[PDB]
């Protein structure tokens, strides 16, 4: 363990530290040391200041396992200091996404959203809910088998991935109350796909629900788009609060 | 005593398109499997469980309540009859559970089973979740006392 610290020594020193700037900078450095070729998967963590050198010497002698352990411990410590930090929330949830704990990943993504916006009473800022993060909970929710939810998050994307939305609605092994979230969906194309699939598989009552949801006068895809954006924001707020009620 | 002919047509009464008839068929199968435990009855029970999964895939929430409130003592009857047909019962129970809990999450409620996790005339999904946990309790007490 050549160097000026031991790993336990620096762990104790950072545990004594509580200055958020140096905490998030050393956390960024540690998560960079983690994400530089620790395994096959290139699930790079989102990070605020990426200035660390990409070149790695002594890559055989470094220990990604100990790096992961200490970075998880430091994440636990900094969330013990203050949970109200969307950046550390994203870091923790991305670590859990790497460790394939998808329930906890959704939990901390939703807690990040509730940190950044006043419990979704305002629209979520896209710099926190970037396209990458949304795609992360897309994959997490698809592996968690909540297919209507992953369709709604596909709608939350800046460009709608109708292909993976249809891929998600194809399976019959769902778990997440299709005939209740047909209220929350607001896109005419995915609603049309739902109507066609329900008719194709002979699901008449859900098909009737989808037809009435389309026949809502709130959305018509010909409106002056102010009403459309307001309705989309309202459904975003209510859906996000629904997931926030479900998890945690 | 000359009832056990019912296992000839219980598939047909399951295949009938009426919800009330399908509920009745499932309850009849439950008490038949308590009385006579035949491999024929076991095949019919397996068919019934997969049918119940299919209706779970395709039923809206109001009829979900109206179909899944009465047929759960039928599930504990199945589990008393056939400890082989056991993991399928638990998988279906957990799936019906979490889908009803997701409904409870979707629309606002008061009695809050998500907080109640660590343990009248209410909302239907509340009653359905309470029924589900009660039947799980009954399966466990049954299996503990049943040698």
């Amino acid at each position: 363990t050549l160097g000026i610290m031991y790993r336990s020594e620096l762990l104790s020193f950072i545990k004594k530290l509580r200055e958020p700037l140096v905490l998030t900078i050393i956390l960024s450095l540690f998560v960079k040391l983690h994400n530089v070729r620790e395994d096959i998967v290139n699930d790079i963590t989102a990070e605020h200041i990426s200035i660390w050198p990409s070149s790695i010497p002594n890559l055989q002698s470094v220990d990604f396992e100990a790096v992961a352990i200490t970075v998880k411990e430091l994440v636990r410590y900094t969330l013990s200091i203050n949970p109200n930090n969307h950046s550390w929330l994203i870091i923790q949830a991305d670590i859990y996404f790497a460790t394939n704990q998808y329930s906890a990943a959704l939990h901390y993504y939703l807690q990040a959203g509730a940190v950044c916006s006043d419990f979704f009473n305002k629209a979520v800022p896209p710099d926190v809910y970037t396209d990458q993060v949304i795609k992360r909970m897309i994959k997490c929710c698809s592996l968690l088998n909540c297919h209507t939810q992953v369709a709604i998050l596909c709608q939350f994307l800046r460009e709608i991935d109708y292909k993976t939305a249809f891929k998600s609605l194809q399976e019959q092994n769902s778990h997440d109350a299709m005939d209740s979230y047909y209220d929350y969906i607001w896109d005419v194309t995915i609603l049309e796909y739902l109507t066609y699939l329900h008719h194709k598989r002979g699901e008449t009552d859900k098909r009737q629900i989808a037809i009435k949801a389309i026949g809502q006068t709130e959305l018509n895809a010909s409106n002056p788009e102010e009403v459309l954006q307001l309705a989309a924001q309202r459904r975003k707020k209510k859906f996000l609060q629904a997931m926030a009620k479900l998890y945690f | 005593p000359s009832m056990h002919i019912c296992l000839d047509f219980i598939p047909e009464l399951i295949a009938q398109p009426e919800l009330e008839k399908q509920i009745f068929a499932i309850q009849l199968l439950s008490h038949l499997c308590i009385q006579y435990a035949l491999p024929k009855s076991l095949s019919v029970a397996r068919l019934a469980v997969n049918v119940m999964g299919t209706l779970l895939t395709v039923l809206t929430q109001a009829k979900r309540y109206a179909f899944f409130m009465p047929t759960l003592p039928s599930l504990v009857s199945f589990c008393r009859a056939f400890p082989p047909l056991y993991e399928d019962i638990m998988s279906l129970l957990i799936q019906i559970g979490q889908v009803c809990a997701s409904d409870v999450a979707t629309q606002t409620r008061d009695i809050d089973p998500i907080i109640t996790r660590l343990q009248g005339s209410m909302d239907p999904d509340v009653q359905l979740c309470h029924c589900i946990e009660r039947t799980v309790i009954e399966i466990i007490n049954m299996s503990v006392s049943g040698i």
């Binding site: 008449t204 | 295949a15 398109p17 095949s43 068919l47 997969n50 049918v51 999964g53 299919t54």
Partner: peptide, 26 residues
């Protein structure tokens, strides 16, 4: 001039021998 054909086809599902279809309402 041929109208639509409503099906009662076998709905395949796993977790009275793999050939069962719940009838739809006509």
């Amino acid at each position: 001039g041929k109208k639509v054909v409503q099906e009662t086809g076998i709905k395949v599902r796993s977790r009275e021998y793999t050939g069962f279809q719940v009838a739809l309402l006509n």
